[PDB]
Amino acid sequence: SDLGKKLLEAARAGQDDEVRILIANGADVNAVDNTGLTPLHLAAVSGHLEIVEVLLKHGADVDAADVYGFTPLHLAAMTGHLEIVEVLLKYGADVNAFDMTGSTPLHLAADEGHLEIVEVLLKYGADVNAQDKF
Amino acid sequence: AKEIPEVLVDPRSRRRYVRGRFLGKGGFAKCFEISDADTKEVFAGKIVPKSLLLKPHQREKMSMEISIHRSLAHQHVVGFHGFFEDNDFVFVVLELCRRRSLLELHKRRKALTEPEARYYLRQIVLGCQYLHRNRVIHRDLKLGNLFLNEDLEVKIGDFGLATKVEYDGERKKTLCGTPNYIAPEVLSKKGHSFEVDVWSIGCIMYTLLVGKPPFETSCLKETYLRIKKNEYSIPKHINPVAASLIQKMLQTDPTARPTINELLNDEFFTSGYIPARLPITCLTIPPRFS
Ligand SMILES: CCN1C(=O)C(/C=N/c2ccnc(N(C)C3CCN(C)CC3)c2)=[SH]C/1=C(/C#N)C(=O)NCC(F)(F)F
Helix, strand or coil: CHHHHHHHHHHHHCCHHHHHHHHHCCCCCCCCCCCCCCHHHHHHHHCCHHHHHHHHHCCCCCCCCCCCCCCHHHHHHHHCCHHHHHHHHHCCCCCCCCCCCCCCHHHHHHHCCCHHHHHHHHHCCCCCCCCCCC | CCCCCCEEECCCCCCEEEEEEEEEEECCEEEEEEEECCCCCEEEEEEEEHHHCCCHHHHHHHHHHHHHHCCCCCCCECCEEEEEECCCEEEEEECCCCCCEHHHHHHHHCCCCHHHHHHHHHHHHHHHHHHHHCCEECCCCCHHHEEECCCCCEEECCCCCCEECCCCCCCECCCCCCCCCCCHHHHCCCCECCHHHHHHHHHHHHHHHHCCCCCCCCCHHHHHHHHHCCCCCCCCCCCHHHHHHHHHHCCCCHHHCCCHHHHHCCHHHCCCCCCCCCCHHHHCCCCCCC
């Protein structure tokens, strides 16, 4: 998709108005790049709160996993974007989602010293003993 | 063509490994997450159908990968846990590298900052120095077999094109496949040795700092002519010490490149900041003090 590639670029670059236009013109909000990043992943990790909300309202898959197993919540938690962490949880993000190391958004936030995020994730039911099994 | 058993049984130990998710494939191999049904320990299982091993150069590749890798143990080499077979498949049990490879990092980041290039390149060169001192030439170093563990530590893998040097000054004359970064002496009749690994590290260094490959164009013929003629350009924004080290490694005459130890001791490795740890954000977006 040409609109898919354009929407990925707009979301990464934080171009709010270019994102609203592409969506209105038929852009796949669930477009995926060559390592599984979606527009929501790219807005989340770049700190673009308005684009995160726009994407979620236009049906963005809140638990889309990239080639590391990161959800947009993993990326928001490791980069310290508290408002995006909250918006994602409100849109039903799995607070205990596991990446391919068995790490939750909480493990990643703790490792990066984002202790405000650690506190918020514990508030929305993050389990410190979350364990991935086979 | 045979389905892979859902449970891998080692006929020696009788350890059972449950087959989980597909991880990757290339040549005759697929790789899967596998777990000890008893200990719950998780490995990468490389699985190769004997239907793809009927030719001499293919049986050679599988056997050579196993005999070379099983003899290796280093901080910067993929852990080798074992190998076994049934009637239809060869199974190789490896260390699972949960943070993918420098290929995935490259596709997301393109050009790294210099400190991050310095962090990764030192680990590549240490792993390769351990290989060269054990008389192992890898011959196929590429972003995709420079694996990362949970600590973003580089692990060299995929020893399928590797060879053992049997005597001093030996020039190997054959390869059982086509290397990713073709050294000019591989394109010639004169044979090759350890210095193909230094060429490939030069290509990887250029790619990490520049964000594209030094020789690759659309036409394999144009590419090979560029290699033979040593035609490439280092953009002007690369620091001089880094540019100079790319030029030492990307030379036509293999005797003029640095040895793996001379490469490890290059000024590049000491000329700027040496990160202790990279943050996990470095897989997706640039770092500041790194
Ligand atoms: C060194 C051992 N090794 C690994 O540890 C590999 C790890 N790959 C991983 C690790 C974590 N996640 C994935 N995913 C695909 C996930 C699936 C779920 N999804 C949501 C997220 C991604 C893949 S691949 C490998 C190889 C070796 N040797 C190998 O690929 N070799 C080349 C071959 F196959 F060509 F023979």
